[model samples]
Target: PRTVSDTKRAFYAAHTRPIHSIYRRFIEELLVEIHLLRVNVDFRYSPLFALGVVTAFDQFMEGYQPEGDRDRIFHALCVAEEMNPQQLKEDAASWQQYQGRPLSQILDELNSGQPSAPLNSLNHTGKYSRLHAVGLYAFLQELAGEVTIHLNETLDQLAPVIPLPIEKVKRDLELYRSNLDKINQARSLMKELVE
Candidate 1:
């Protein structure tokens, strides 16, 4: 006769660090490939652009982690649900769920809706029920910061590696650099928001 709240508490305590570890691995693997690609482009690209950049990108995306982030998140959700099936059913009956909105959008709505609402609403609520959601949000923001730092370091490492006749792969490299900058900016915003 475990209560739903107790079960959820146990589940969250067990899974929180595992989620963080898995997420860290995911981002670290991506950075490794980014570094690998940068090194390959710097050292191996020929006049024909035969460094297999496209293939490397595809393989990195496909073969990096078979479990995949979507599967991990879904699996975690399922495990959480299974911990208290009756509670899940009861909660599922509620019509107040945020449907398909991204975290940023939900946060935006919350922020814009109530100026007086505590920005750290979940932390201040003093209720453990929503703690996992809040933890996940904070964990992801931290992960984003880690990723931004790694990307910046990698970019710096890559600056001198651009080979001669840079025009050949200039567009692709610029695009890649631009993408890194965008992620950095997004992560910077995450850091700002959480502060």
Candidate 2:
């Protein structure tokens, strides 16, 4: 009612979920990210975008304590952006089931001039933002060792039609990759305490 960001803080504060210390930073950073995008006129939320954010959130928040806090934090985060938490969950569930299929088939389909449903969605859409690209990376990482090796090649070919800055795309997603690696190290630290 007042301003784009005026209601944002209340959305997050409304939940007041007690996130454990170990997972607090992860949730907080995500909160700011969505808010930044929420207020941006250029950004639009799509299934792919939701998949990436949901997937990234799930992966990082693994082994979260106060068991109930995980989803609560996620809900609060999404709510803060005035995002549809249920839709994000539904789309994430819908796309995630495609996980068992190999990236080879996925990349091969892209190369054959026919992309998978997800790729098709990206190609057909007139606007493919950085968030969508990150979502693609988030989806691709699930396929095993091949993606880590072929992401550059995959994007290289997909580049002509999509028209993204390959160097920056690579660099940006790598930031997520690196942060995940570091977080996994922290995850293990907590695990060690258990044993």
Which candidate should be chosen as best, given TM-score against the real structure? Answer: 2
User: In candidate 2, where is summed lDDT lowest over 10 consecutive residues?
Assistant: 121-130
Off by over 4 Å in 1: 1-9, 12-165
Clashing pairs in 1: none
TM-score of 1: 0.24
lDDT of 1 at 186: 64
- Each candidate's TM vs. the true structure? 0.24, 0.73
Candidate 2: what lDDT?
A: 0.71
- Model 2: per-residue Cα lDDT at residue 58: 87
Error of 1 at 152 (Å): 20
Superposed by TM-score, candidate 2 places the C-alpha of residue 17 at a distance from the truth, in angstroms, of 15
The lDDT of each candidate is: 0.36, 0.71
lDDT of 1 by residue, 118-144 (tens): 232322322121112222222223322
